[PDB]
């Protein structure tokens, strides 16, 4: 084969070769409306899809809850005080005690699912601030102990719907007798050790209180595996960090609440058995 600028393959094995404001969306029995939402982000431009047999690893017939699990669950609300650094919720670990989705993911061994995350935070025309919502895939976070690595515990690494928080400054877990085994992600490093500024490479939106009060993210199912355990592996992760601090009428104690509404989409399960009863506290 004479290629343009003589390529002959001598080895059978291949490895040996050479080198917009208005929005209303309905999922099941749940409906979401937002008159000042600045469009949606289809993360990586891929809508969630059911597993296709062409790339199907397991054989067992999949149980798709459909309406009973592809609903919008509103996680708890969090106050965005002036001196707040951020929050992070891992998925689907957040939807583990939410309706029938939690039951299905605990009962079934393997499970895949996309998500639709709607972050809601509204302020008056006289408020001043801006949030950034990033859907970090495979979101890891740094530990708190400099004497050990990858030492975080299951209970502390999976807060649930309560979520987690970013700390302004790192603080080693100096306790050498009973280490807390707890995440200590620095806000500007984003926890992973990278920089916040570059974090925009991830699928993201910005809730700028002057322009929009909502942020919609359609997160597909990204994973090295077509289907994987939901109780072990947390595919995505939502991180909400305030790019610019809240401010209002020269008032030093302004608070506004931020809410999340997550809807599993095209969620499929396999491998039914006794129900997982994990230790979380």
């Amino acid at each position: 084969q004479v290629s343009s600028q003589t390529t002959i393959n001598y080895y059978r094995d291949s490895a040996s070769n050479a080198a917009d404001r208005v929005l209303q969306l309905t999922l099941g029995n749940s409906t979401i409306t937002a008159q000042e939402a600045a469009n949606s982000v289809v993360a990586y431009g891929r809508w969630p899809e059911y597993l296709r047999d062409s790339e199907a690893n397991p054989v067992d017939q999949p149980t798709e809850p459909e309406v009973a699990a592809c609903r919008f669950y509103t996680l708890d609300t969090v106050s965005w005080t002036k001196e707040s650094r951020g929050w992070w919720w891992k998925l689907p670990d957040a939807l583990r005690d939410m309706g029938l989705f939690g039951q299905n993911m605990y009962y079934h061994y393997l499970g895949r699912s996309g998500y639709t995350v709607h972050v809601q935070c509204n302020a008056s025309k006289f408020h001043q601030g801006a949030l950034g919502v990033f859907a970090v895939p495979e979101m890891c976070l740094a530990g708190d102990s400099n004497t050990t690595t990858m030492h975080t515990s299951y209970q502390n690494a999976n807060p649930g719907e309560k979520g987690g928080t970013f700390t302004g400054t790192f603080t080693p877990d100096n306790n050498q007798t009973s280490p807390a085994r707890r995440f200590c992600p620095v806000d500007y490093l984003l926890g992973n050790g990278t920089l916040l500024g570059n974090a925009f490479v991830f699928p993201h939106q910005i809730i700028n209180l002057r322009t929009n009060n909502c942020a919609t993210l359609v997160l597909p199912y990204v994973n090295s595996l077509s289907i994987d355990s939901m109780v072990k592996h947390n595919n995505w992760g939502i991180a909400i960090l305030p790019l610019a601090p809240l401010n209002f009428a020269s008032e030093s104690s302004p608070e506004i609440p931020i809410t999340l509404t997550i809807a599993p989409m095209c969620c499929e399960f396999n491998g039914l058995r006794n129900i997982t009863l994990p230790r979380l506290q």
Binding site: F126, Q128, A130, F200, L243, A244, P245, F248, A249
Partner: peptide, 12 residues
């Protein structure tokens, strides 16, 4: 009046 008097702009 009754509005914050210190804005912030973010670059990209």
């Amino acid at each position: 009046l009754s509005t914050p008097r210190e804005m912030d702009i973010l670059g990209f």
